[PDB]
Design a protein around this motif. Structure first.
Motif, short mmCIF file in Angstrom:
data_model
loop_
_atom_site.label_atom_id
_atom_site.label_comp_id
_atom_site.label_asym_id
_atom_site.label_seq_id
_atom_site.Cartn_x
_atom_site.Cartn_y
_atom_site.Cartn_z
N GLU A 126 -0.91 -7.97 -8.37
CA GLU A 126 -2.00 -7.01 -8.47
C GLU A 126 -2.96 -7.47 -9.56
N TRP A 167 -10.91 7.00 2.18
CA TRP A 167 -11.07 6.70 0.77
C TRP A 167 -10.51 5.36 0.35
N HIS A 168 -11.13 4.75 -0.66
CA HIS A 168 -10.63 3.52 -1.25
C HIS A 168 -10.97 3.51 -2.74
N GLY A 169 -9.95 3.53 -3.57
CA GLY A 169 -10.14 3.48 -5.01
C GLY A 169 -9.83 2.10 -5.55
N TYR A 181 3.30 -6.10 -1.34
CA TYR A 181 2.57 -4.95 -0.74
C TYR A 181 3.43 -4.25 0.29
N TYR A 200 -6.26 -1.27 2.33
CA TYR A 200 -5.60 0.03 2.23
C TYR A 200 -6.53 1.19 1.99
N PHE A 201 -6.28 2.32 2.67
CA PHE A 201 -7.09 3.52 2.62
C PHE A 201 -6.25 4.80 2.61
N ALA A 202 -6.78 5.88 2.04
CA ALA A 202 -6.12 7.17 1.99
C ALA A 202 -7.05 8.23 2.61
N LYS A 226 -5.06 10.29 -4.00
CA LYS A 226 -4.23 9.11 -3.75
C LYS A 226 -5.04 7.86 -4.05
N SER A 227 -6.30 7.81 -3.61
CA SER A 227 -7.19 6.68 -3.88
C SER A 227 -7.67 6.69 -5.34
N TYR A 266 -5.85 4.90 -8.04
CA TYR A 266 -6.07 3.46 -8.05
C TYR A 266 -7.32 3.06 -8.88
N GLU A 302 -1.47 6.61 4.42
CA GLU A 302 -2.21 5.42 4.08
C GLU A 302 -2.52 4.64 5.37
#
Ligand SMILES: C[C@]1(c2nc3cccc(C(N)=O)c3[nH]2)CCCN1
Length: 351
Positions: free
Chosen positions: A103, A201-203, A229, A236-238, A243-244, A247, A328
């Motif tokens: 990561e 969403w994507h954080g 992973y 990856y998306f929420a 949740k995002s 991140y 996810e």
């Protein structure tokens, strides 16, 4: 000359191109700034430590001795200088030790992208640096009016999908941007009419947004281990904002973060309850839906510009023995995403 861009746009450009934020992330990662400075960061060095990190994972789950592990752990710290002084580096003997490092290298690669955009190019003191840097992103960024329309859907989505298990902070939408990456709509053409297109969403850390806005959401390199992973290497998306948001890696010493909204073409979802380190999807499938215990109310699903927005309050999904508390979504082709909006959030911590 001064920038004619709106102030929220200017503050976004300052935030993402901050050289001191890039340095701050690298110290958090325990990197020796004398042996591996910001300007001496390279893609081929990161690719090389990924290969040794794959070799560490190859030995951790192959039941290797702690002495066979040590040699491989040390080899990783050779390629990525860590600031431990004259002490031995922490041993990477477990699976989570390795994911953390895989990561770190994903975040190091996008810091190099940001810094190389800045350090590359031309020098002209007569131009506003904020206007210069904005152009580098090759993206159209517009402020979305609070009294609109699309801003009411977006604000409902944020207000309705904050999970009860992420109650240590609340979120405030500071600014809502509509973003348009040059060439993305055209890259999206084979998927524009696909079924299961969802606004998700994507954080990410703020230090990755110069590379996200310039290169788009990307998958990890071939050198990165797929075991690093839950559903392998994909985007990856929420459906749950919190949740995002988790991140964004925002804290009390940095409560401002950035989160994306993208139109994801999911199509034929390969539903999964537990981790699966897949390389490719099974024939006929276009995405992975990691089924979580809780899900937004399906009767509350709304349509924004033909895309489905899962903005309902969380309810039980009816999913039996699942590893996930929330859903996810993973796509394994970069062309399956169209980044629509970018939000600036203030995290109000209760902790
Ligand atoms: C653990 C991992 C990840 N899982 C997620 C699930 C939902 C959303 C996001 C996000 N970034 O908004 C996730 N990111 C795998 C790829 C790197 N981080």
């Amino acid at each position: 000359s001064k920038s004619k861009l709106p102030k929220p746009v200017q503050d976004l450009i300052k935030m993402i191109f901050d050289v001191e934020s890039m340095k701050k992330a690298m110290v958090e990662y325990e990197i020796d700034l004398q042996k591996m400075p910001l300007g001496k960061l390279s893609k081929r060095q990161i690719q090389a430590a990924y290969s040794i990190l794959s070799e560490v994972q190859q030995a951790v789950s192959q039941g290797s001795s702690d002495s066979q592990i040590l040699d491989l752990s040390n080899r990783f710290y050779t390629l990525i200088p860590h600031d431990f002084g004259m002490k031995k580096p922490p041993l990477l003997n477990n699976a989570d030790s390795v994911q953390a490092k895989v990561e770190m290298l994903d975040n190091l690669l996008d810091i190099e992208v940001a810094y190389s955009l800045l350090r590359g190019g031309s020098d002209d003191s007569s131009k506003d640096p904020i206007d210069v840097n904005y152009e580098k992103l090759k993206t159209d960024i517009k402020v979305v009016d609070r009294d609109s329309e699309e801003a009411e859907i977006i604000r409902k989505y944020v207000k309705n999908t904050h999970a009860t298990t992420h109650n240590a902070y609340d979120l405030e939408v500071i600014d809502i941007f509509k973003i348009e990456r040059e060439g993305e709509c055209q890259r999206y053409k084979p998927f524009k009419q696909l079924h299961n297109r969802r606004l998700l969403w994507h954080g990410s850390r703020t230090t990755n947004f110069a590379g996200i806005l310039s290169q788009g959401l990307r998958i990890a390199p071939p050198e990165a281990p797929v075991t690093g992973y839950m559903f392998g290497k994909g985007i990856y998306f929420a459906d749950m904002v919190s949740k995002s948001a988790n991140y964004c890696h925002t804290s009390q010493g940095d409560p401002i973060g950035l989160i994306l909204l993208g139109e994801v073409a999911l199509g034929n979802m390969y539903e999964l309850k537990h981790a699966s380190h897949i390389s490719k999807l099974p024939k006929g499938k276009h995405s992975v839906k990691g089924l979580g215990k809780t899900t937004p109310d399906p009767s509350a699903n709304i349509s924004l510009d033909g895309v489905d927005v899962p903005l309902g309050t969380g309810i039980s999904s009816g999913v039996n023995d699942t590893s996930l508390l929330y859903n996810e979504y993973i796509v394994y082709d970069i062309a399956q995403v169209n980044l629509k909006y970018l939000l600036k959030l203030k995290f109000n911590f209760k902790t």
